[PDB]
Amino acid sequence: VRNKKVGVIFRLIQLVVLVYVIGWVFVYEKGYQTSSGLISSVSVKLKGLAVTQLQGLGPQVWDVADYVFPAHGDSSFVVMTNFIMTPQQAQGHCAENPEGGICQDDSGCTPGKAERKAQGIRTGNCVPFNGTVKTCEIFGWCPVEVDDKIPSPALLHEAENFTLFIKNSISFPRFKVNRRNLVEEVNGTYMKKCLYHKILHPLCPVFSLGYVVRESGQDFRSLAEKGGVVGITIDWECDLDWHVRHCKPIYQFHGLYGEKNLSPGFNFRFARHFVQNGTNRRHLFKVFGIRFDILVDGKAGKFDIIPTMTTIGSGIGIFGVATVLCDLLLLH
Amino acid sequence: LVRNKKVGVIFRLIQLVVLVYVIGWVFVYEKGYQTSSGLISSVSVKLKGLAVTQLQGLGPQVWDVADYVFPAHGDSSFVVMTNFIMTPQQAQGHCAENPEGGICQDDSGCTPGKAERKAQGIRTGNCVPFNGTVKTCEIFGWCPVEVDDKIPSPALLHEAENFTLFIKNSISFPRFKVNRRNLVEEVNGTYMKKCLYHKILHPLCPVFSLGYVVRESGQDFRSLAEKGGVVGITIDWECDLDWHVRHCKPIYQFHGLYGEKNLSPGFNFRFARHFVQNGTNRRHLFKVFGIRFDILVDGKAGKFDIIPTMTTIGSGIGIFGVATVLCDLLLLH
Amino acid sequence: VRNKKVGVIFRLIQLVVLVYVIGWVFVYEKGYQTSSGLISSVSVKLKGLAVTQLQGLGPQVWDVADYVFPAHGDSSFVVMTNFIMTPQQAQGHCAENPEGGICQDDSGCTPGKAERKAQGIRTGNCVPFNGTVKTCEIFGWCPVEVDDKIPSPALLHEAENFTLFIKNSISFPRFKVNRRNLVEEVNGTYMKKCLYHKILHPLCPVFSLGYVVRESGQDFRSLAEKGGVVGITIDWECDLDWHVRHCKPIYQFHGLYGEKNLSPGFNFRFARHFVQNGTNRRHLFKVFGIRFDILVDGKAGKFDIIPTMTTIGSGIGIFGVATVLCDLLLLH
Numbered sequence A, C: 001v002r003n004k005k006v007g008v009i010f011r012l013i014q015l016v017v018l019v020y021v022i023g024w025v026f027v028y029e030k031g032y033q034t035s036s037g038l039i040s041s042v043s044v045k046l047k048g049l050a051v052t053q054l055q056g057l058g059p060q061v062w063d064v065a066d067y068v069f070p071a072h073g074d075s076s077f078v079v080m081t082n083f084i085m086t087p088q089q090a091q092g093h094c095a096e097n098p099e100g101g102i103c104q105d106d107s108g109c110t111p112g113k114a115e116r117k118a119q120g121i122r123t124g125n126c127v128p129f130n131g132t133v134k135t136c137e138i139f140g141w142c143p144v145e146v147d148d149k150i151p152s153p154a155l156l157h158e159a160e161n162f163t164l165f166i167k168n169s170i171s172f173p174r175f176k177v178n179r180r181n182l183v184e185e186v187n188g189t190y191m192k193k194c195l196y197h198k199i200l201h202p203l204c205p206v207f208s209l210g211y212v213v214r215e216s217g218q219d220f221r222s223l224a225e226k227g228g229v230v231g232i233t234i235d236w237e238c239d240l241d242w243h244v245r246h247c248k249p250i251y252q253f254h255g256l257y258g259e260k261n262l263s264p265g266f267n268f269r270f271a272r273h274f275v276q277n278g279t280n281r282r283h284l285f286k287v288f289g290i291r292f293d294i295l296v297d298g299k300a301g302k303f304d305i306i307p308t309m310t311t312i313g314s315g316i317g318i319f320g321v322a323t324v325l326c327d328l329l330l331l332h
Numbered sequence B: 001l002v003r004n005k006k007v008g009v010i011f012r013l014i015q016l017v018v019l020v021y022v023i024g025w026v027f028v029y030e031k032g033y034q035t036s037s038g039l040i041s042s043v044s045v046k047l048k049g050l051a052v053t054q055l056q057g058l059g060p061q062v063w064d065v066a067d068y069v070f071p072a073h074g075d076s077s078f079v080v081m082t083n084f085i086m087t088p089q090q091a092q093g094h095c096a097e098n099p100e101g102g103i104c105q106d107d108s109g110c111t112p113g114k115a116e117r118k119a120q121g122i123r124t125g126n127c128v129p130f131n132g133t134v135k136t137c138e139i140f141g142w143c144p145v146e147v148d149d150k151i152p153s154p155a156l157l158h159e160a161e162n163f164t165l166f167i168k169n170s171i172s173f174p175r176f177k178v179n180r181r182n183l184v185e186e187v188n189g190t191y192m193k194k195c196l197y198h199k200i201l202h203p204l205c206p207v208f209s210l211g212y213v214v215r216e217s218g219q220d221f222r223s224l225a226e227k228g229g230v231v232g233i234t235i236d237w238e239c240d241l242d243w244h245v246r247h248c249k250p251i252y253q254f255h256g257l258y259g260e261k262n263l264s265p266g267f268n269f270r271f272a273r274h275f276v277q278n279g280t281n282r283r284h285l286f287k288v289f290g291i292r293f294d295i296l297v298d299g300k301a302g303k304f305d306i307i308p309t310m311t312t313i314g315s316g317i318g319i320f321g322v323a324t325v326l327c328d329l330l331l332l333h
């Protein structure tokens, strides 16, 4: 390389490369710290109550143990928003649902079980389901669940006021640091009366379900009418070089949905088996509820000698490479 | 200094090859001009089917969607009932324990307390004969102790290979703010009315046959349902957002998570349905051997961006210079 | 650059760079092995029994299907350690909990529902909860749960003898290799009588809950009194270049806890609905239990030729770069 008093033409390039190395690779990219993931655990608590007046059954009270189907508290929990109830289900021959099939004569139906959407073992006769249409007689739960009529006004429409408390405990084992979403800032008197907000209360662990649904980008009424999916993501990007107080979680609410023309909403059927008058019966509930999925992911970085030395060596190497490259480009 | 005296194309061809490699595998193949991110996915599983099991002494039992589905709400890890051992009318009262726990001919042999390993009840101290042949120790617990020695070889819920499964997978890339569902624009309502998933015939069908899934996982459905098994369905969403969003389609892959059948074969678990009958708190115990289906979704997106393109061009120029210098030094020794 | 009897000054640097390439880059970092992840499935089985004598209810036997709420078997499961029981809950008008509010006269309470911690629809009257304090009349579960007195002696304190058998089946699909925690070493007679230990029995699949809690860094009594979270991480770092017998899992126990002054432990509520004497009743249970979450992650490495050639090429390149750099640094 010719050095006939080139001047600052390459001396400035050297300084620029050095500044870039010491700023972006070392400080910006946090190259002087080792990073590790966390082990996380989420507990959910839904405080609320819903009094639903249902024709033929009277008032029904839904408490924390009622709308919460897991009833133990985990990441993927579902809060009841609407339900279709078919009680007093006993095992006996009965007329099947009109959606399964319509046979005016008993010769039309065949003894056996349907391959698609099996509702029961067909006896072989067609018993009129009502005065208009006739269905085939099958053995199974006698009161069939007719989901054709879905309640337009949400029965558990108060779910937008059911307070959701999320206790997220994370632990970095590489540095042996255990933290919880209940930061030192948050305390008892705060949790006595507080609601989470993006800017007002960014650390409140009490998330209003309505507020969460609104932040996810969905209307609470239309979603509760049929069902939906909301994902709460808890990030724990922190720097352990500072005090532990400066580490705070970040909550982000996403809405997982799709086209409302094909299978709109989230619905599932469950049963409550019991024994009444010496007979084994059950109450079938087809519930459309919102599925809240909690995903916690974070990373902690602490100062370490080996990564710092490795980054310094790589920076010196790339500085030399860039100097040689710029010299060759200037000299062509 | 590098000697340059009519070297020829010996190094020019090397430079051209390096430039092609930079503009190719580095840029086009590895998608160096696109930024990538993961998705937030949620799975909803719905089982459609019904099983009529004729049990001696209990009559016909109808297992519907709310019966074989134990979570009953829909989770990535869900178990479908395939066989069960039923013990009804369990009430709290002193009774003879299981012969597997312990055999004592005389009451002095048993000691009052609780067994340290595989505890079945608080030992009363007396040995009440479980039957005419063997004598077990009296313990205070559920009087009809469950005897799982005889597992039904013909699967009670053997019709599980025809039960349909609908999986609704909702993914969302927040970096690009794009939401997608496994129900692609191609899959329509009339299609979903009558459809079964297949590898080549129906690669986008969201309706899976449990028997077909078990066959694709690499296991026989009968032997699995007899004792239990684990099937993992992986949903991939590798897509490129540079094209139209319609071209983004999920990929379903089935795996069988099994082990040596000589030590603890299958998946079994005991659950109890409690109730009140005749003013007494009783329960029905079920030891169910079922298939555990674990739904795992993993995917990544890609969208054009300026900064990745610039840094890839920079790295390409940097390595093109280094490779040229290295080839020149190797040629000149 | 200048090459005139430079000596071994740069030859030693070249040799060191070559050793670094053929060593840490190739041997240590497994540059000749491609890596693949696994699909995992955890199955838990609890064995044990604990009779909890409760005043007014008699002996209560708790079996595997009782304290294990995820009876279907799940990685994230809760084991009942203490419970507050309120039996025979029927829907009707009753006095609310004194924690909600105290109104001496009926005019003090207002008809409707509470916004925070709703216990029931207020009827507008104040019926005395007892002889001392007076609360507002609400419609709901008549036996309101009074969780003020938490039993200091843990009812299910025998949870430290509840043997936990974990079956973790993993599969690497890229290499199509299936593995299970029941390794070839662990035989039937071994599983007949063994307890897991860090050094003594590092392969026994029977984990004692008390031992796990002790290894997590928490006392079992104080934790079971109010609840806790213990996470079991099962790693499967293996090298498929050797025989599959050498691949053994690694179990680690972490304790995910926080400040005990604000929301201590893990607690939830559930109910058992039934029909007695023609009336729909339930038994409410507020359970303080330990939450066990099983997280499984691993990596399998198999010899491949493409990563080997890539690492060889990168090593030759960085060796040439380091040679040029050291020569330029020596010649200034």
Ligand SMILES: Nc1ncnc2c1ncn2[C@@H]1O[C@H](COP(=O)(O)OP(=O)(O)OP(=O)(O)O)[C@@H](O)[C@H]1O
Binding pocket: A147, A262, A263, A264, A265, A267, B046, B047, B048, B164, B165, B166, B192, B193, B207
């Ligand atoms: N497991 C399944 N097997 C086959 N088809 C299914 C299954 N689950 C859903 N479907 C079909 O997809 C439609 C929409 O699915 P979705 O989960 O929204 O149920 P739905 O509309 O409430 O109907 P249903 O009450 O019959 O479950 C169903 O009406 C049915 O035609």
Ligand SMILES: Nc1ncnc2c1ncn2[C@@H]1O[C@H](COP(=O)(O)OP(=O)(O)OP(=O)(O)O)[C@@H](O)[C@H]1O
Binding pocket: B118, B148, B263, B264, B265, B268, C045, C046, C047, C162, C163, C164, C165, C191, C192, C206
């Ligand atoms: N938590 C546990 N503590 C001790 N032994 C256990 C535990 N879980 C399973 N085992 C033992 O593992 C072996 C196989 O259990 P597996 O569940 O595969 O079969 P099983 O016949 O259903 O067992 P069991 O009748 O004891 O429930 C048996 O010896 C069983 O006692």
Ligand SMILES: Nc1ncnc2c1ncn2[C@@H]1O[C@H](COP(=O)(O)OP(=O)(O)OP(=O)(O)O)[C@@H](O)[C@H]1O
Binding pocket: A045, A046, A047, A163, A164, A165, A191, A192, A206, C117, C147, C262, C263, C264, C267
């Ligand atoms: N979803 C929620 N909405 C409002 N406050 C809540 C919620 N979950 C918990 N809290 C409050 O957090 C504090 C401690 O919560 P924790 O989960 O330990 O319940 P707790 O102390 O057993 O009380 P409770 O029996 O009322 O649930 C209490 O003040 C409690 O009322």
Ligand SMILES: Nc1cc(C(F)(F)F)cc(C(F)(F)F)c1
Binding pocket: A074, A075, A076, B075, B076, B077, C074, C075, C076, C077
């Ligand atoms: N085994 C298990 C359990 C849950 C839970 F229901 F127990 F929380 C969730 C999951 C998830 F799908 F999230 F991975 C897995």
Ligand SMILES: [Ca+2]
Binding pocket: A273, A274, A275, A276, B275, B276, B277, C273, C274, C275, C276
């Ligand atoms: Ca009952």
Ligand SMILES: [Mg+2]
Binding pocket: A099, A147, A148
């Ligand atoms: Mg329908």
Ligand SMILES: [Mg+2]
Binding pocket: B100, B148, B149
């Ligand atoms: Mg047994």
Ligand SMILES: [Mg+2]
Binding pocket: C099, C147
């Ligand atoms: Mg309270």
